[PDB]
Amino acid sequence: STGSATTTPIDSLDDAYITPVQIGTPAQTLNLDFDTGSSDLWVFSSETTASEVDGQTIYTPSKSTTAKLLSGATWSISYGDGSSSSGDVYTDTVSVGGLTVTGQAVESAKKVSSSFTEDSTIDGLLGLAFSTLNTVSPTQQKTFFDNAKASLDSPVFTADLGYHAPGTYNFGFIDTTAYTGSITYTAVSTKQGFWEWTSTGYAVGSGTFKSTSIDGIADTGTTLLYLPATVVSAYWAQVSGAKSSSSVGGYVFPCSATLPSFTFGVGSARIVIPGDYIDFGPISTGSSSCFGGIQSSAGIGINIFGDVALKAAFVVFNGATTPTLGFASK
Ligand SMILES: C[C@@H](N)COc1cc(Cl)cc(Cl)c1
Ligand SMILES: C[C@H](N)COc1cc(Cl)cc(Cl)c1
């Protein structure tokens, strides 16, 4: 089997991407944030504290004839940006782009943090990292991809995120018309539960490529590109007037600037992020100071190839016995 679904930016800045997902019988369609950096499929629901729901579409398990409460199971997640959510668990039928999994764990939120409430466009998350990170207790549950994998034509999914435009998540096949050149594959460590890999280096604009190992994670659920302080300083030094602002929380730059591209290495291959992808717009409405899309990972503990990087590529998440990651230009 295969599936294919369009993913759409939630706003004009590509702050996140939502993909429609059918849950239950009859289907309840929710727009979920597909997140290769986590492993829980959780949704706003009829059980969510009312004051914490503000415009989201909710899953109502009592209206699904295939929903079953997973007795005694709870979940609770804290994401790296400080947001969090928790609740109980159902199993139900879940379909993405024509690919159906029966008995998928659907984690129904009883509580969500303010950042989730304040984003009316995201109805929940669909985790695509390794199932070892799933938070359901006392019996850990499998991700949608892990449940589907044996039925898929090939045990893979691909992320093709658009810049200011829709894109595609495919399951079970590689669309060879969706990229240029070849896909370069690179080794993955699953020891931390992530799609963790090592980039071979970087360049800023038309500058010389610096060969250096950068260990990080491929994370569709993180907006920005978080890299070591030395790398980030080298990038922003090429933008007149850019500076790291402790009050704002990162590098900012004059909105009138033209940003240079940023290239990252995948083996001998090179993925070029156009400068415009690095502009996240005014720091507050009406400001002429803009937020940068490349930020320091200091204090995260890991480098993160978020949407800024991934949307410059066609990305293969290969879930074979030994997982690998593939990148192509597009
Ligand atoms: C839950 C994880 N997928 C999130 O990963 C992180 C963690 C931190 Cl501390 C910061 C950022 Cl931007 C991302
Ligand atoms: C009707 C078209 N052939 C559809 O092609 C596209 C074009 C963009 Cl920009 C994004 C996506 Cl998801 C699909």
What would the 3-class secondary structure string for 70-117 be? EEEEEEEEECCCCCEEEEEEEEEEEEECCEEEEEEEEEEEEEECHHHH
Q: Hey, what are 203's tokens? A: 């360049």
The two structure tokens encoding residue 271: 């993925």
Distances (CA, A) of 101 to 1, 23, 38, 82, 160: 11, 10, 19, 31, 22
Quick one: 125 and 199 in the same domain?
A: no
| Domain around 167 | 5-174
Pocket mutation for ligand 1, best pick of 130, 194, 222 (most atoms within 8 Å of C-beta): 222
194: helix, coil or strand? coil
Task: Please choose, from the candidates 153, 150, 137, the residue with its C-alpha nearest in 3D space to the C-alpha of residue 40.
Answer: 137
Asked whether residue 272 falls in the same domain as residue 192, the answer is yes
Distance CA 160, CA 181 (A): 15
* Nearest atom within ligand 2 for CA of residue 165: 9
d(CA 308, CA 4): 22
Alpha-carbon gap, residue 152 to 158, rounded angstroms: 13
- List the catalytic residue out of 64, 199, 296, 297: 199
| Degrees, nearest 5: CA angle 56-306-180 | 110
Boundary (domain end) residue, out of 150, 174, 198: 174
Three-state DSSP class for residue 235: helix
Could you tell me if 150 and 205 lie in one domain? Answer: no
Which of 19, 161, 168 has most ligand 2 atoms within 8 Å of its beta carbon, as the pocket-test mutant? 168
Whether 196 and 170 map to the same domain: the answer is no
Q: Mark whether 88 is an active-site residue.
A: no
> Which amino acid type is present at position 325?
L
CA–CA separation, 281 and 252 (whole Å): 10
Any idea which residue has 């593939």 for tokens?
Answer: 326
Q: Which residues contact 176 (CB under 8 A, 6 or more apart)?
A: none
Secondary structure (3-state) at 164: coil
Q: What's phi and psi for 127, nearest 5 deg?
A: -75, 140
Query: Looking at the 3D structure of the chain, how many domains does it have?
Result: 2
Structure tokens at 147: 């449940």
User: How far apart are alpha carbons 66 and 186 in whole angstroms?
Assistant: 40
Which residues lie below 8 Å from residue 319, measured CB to CB, with a gap of 6+? 145, 146, 149, 155, 156, 157
8-state DSSP, 262: E
Q: Which residues contact 128 (CB under 8 A, 6 or more apart)?
A: 34, 35, 36, 39, 143, 144, 145, 157, 220, 317
Tell me the three state secondary structure of residue 63.
helix
Q: Is the CB of 175 under 6 A from ligand 2?
A: no
Ligand 2 centre and the CA of 240: distance in Å? 36
Ligand 2 midpoint to CA 310 (Å):
18
Return the ligand number nearest the Cα of 127. Answer: 1
* Final residue belonging to a domain, choices 174, 191, 209: 174
- Domain shared by 190 and 170, yes or no: no
Residues 143 and 250 reside in one and the same domain: no
Enter the tokens of residue 68: 């079953």
30 within 8 A of 23, measured Cβ to Cβ: yes
Reduce the DSSP state of residue 2 to 3 states and report it: coil
Domain end, chosen from 143, 174, 205, is at 174
Which among 125, 295, 300, 307 is the best mutation to test ligand 1's pocket, defined by most ligand atoms within 8 Å of the CB?
300
Among all bound ligands, the one having the nearest atom to the CA of 223 is 1
User: Both 98 and 165 in a single domain?
Assistant: yes
Which two three-digit tokens encode residue 284? 């507050």
CA distance 186 to 178: 19
If asked whether residues 303 and 316 sit together in one domain, one would say yes
Choosing from 14, 33, 35, 119, the catalytic residue is: 35
Question: Which atom of ligand 2 lies at the shortest distance from residue 160's CA?
Answer: 12
Question: CA angle at residue 100 from 102 to 65, to 5 degrees?
Answer: 50
Do 104 and 212 reside in the same domain of the chain?
A: no
In the reported structure, the alpha carbon of residue 265 is separated from the centroid of ligand 1 by a whole-number distance in angstroms of 22
Residues, the chain = 330
CA–CA separation, 20 vs 33, rounded Å?
A: 9
In this structure, what DSSP letter does residue 148 have?
Answer: H
42 closest CA partner among 86, 8, 100: 86
Question: Ligand 1 centre and the CA of 1: distance in Å?
Answer: 32
- On whether both 166 and 206 belong to a single domain, the answer is no
- Residue 35 bears catalytic tag: yes
Residue whose Cα lies nearest atom 3 of ligand 1: it is 37
Residue in 14, 48, 58, 23 with CA at minimum distance from that of residue 221:
14
* Pocket lining for ligand 1, CB < 6 angstroms: 37-38, 79-81, 219, 221-222, 226, 300, 304
Q: Which of 34, 220, 33 is nearest to 120 (CA)?
A: 33
How far is the C-alpha of 227 from the C-alpha of 243, rounded, in Å? 16
Residue 81 one-letter amino acid: D
157's CB contacts (< 8 A; 6+ apart) are: 128, 145, 169, 170, 171, 172, 317, 319
Residue 254's identity, in one-letter code, is: P
**One domain, residues 64 and 27:** yes
Main-chain dihedrals φ then ψ at residue 12, nearest 5 degrees: -70, -10
Q: Considering only CA atoms, which residue is closest to atom 11 of ligand 1?
A: 80
Q: How many other β-carbons are positioned within 10 Å of the β-carbon of residue 241?
A: 11
- Cα(74)–Cα(79) distance, rounded to whole angstroms? 17
CA nearest ligand 2 atom 12, residue = 167
**Tokens in use for 265?**
């290495």
Give the Å distance between the CA of 262 and the centre of ligand 1: 21
**Tokens found for residue 304:** 């993160």
- Are 105 and 118 found together in one domain? yes
What distance in Å separates the CA atoms of residue 230 and residue 190, rounded to the nearest whole number? Answer: 26
Q: How many Cβ atoms are within 10 Å of 147's Cβ, its own excluded? A: 18
Q: Which two tokens stand for residue 55?
A: 């415009």
Across-strand partners of 201? Answer: 211
